[PDB]
Amino acid sequence: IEFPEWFHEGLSRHQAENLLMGKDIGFFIIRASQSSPGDFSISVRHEDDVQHFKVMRDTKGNYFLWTEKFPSLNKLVDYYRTTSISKQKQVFLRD
C-alpha cells in the first residue's frame, strides 16, 4: 500500500509479460523501465500476448501515450479504462 505499491518495483519487461499472460485481457502492470532508466512503462494483456506502452511526458509535467494529455498518471490510467489503449483492437485497462 501507498507509495511503494502502485508500480511493481524491480520487475522486468518479460517478467511483466509472464505475470500478465496468467490474467485476462486489459489487465496491466505499471513498471519503471530497465531499458530506459527514468521511464515508466505500461504492460497490458492483449488477446494472445502482452504488449508494452511507454509513458510519454512533456516539459509541463503532462502524461500521455497517444495524443490526449493528462496532468497525472492516475488520470491517464483512468482515461484508458474507457477509451481503448490500442489503436487496432478494443483494449480497456482493468484491475
Binding site: 519487461r13 508494452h52 506502452f53 511507454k54 510519454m56 489503449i85 490500442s86
Partner: peptide, 6 residues
C-alpha cells in the same frame, strides 16, 4: 526496445 505507441 519495442513499444506499441513508439
Amino acid at each position: 526496445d519495442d513499444y506499441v505507441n513508439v
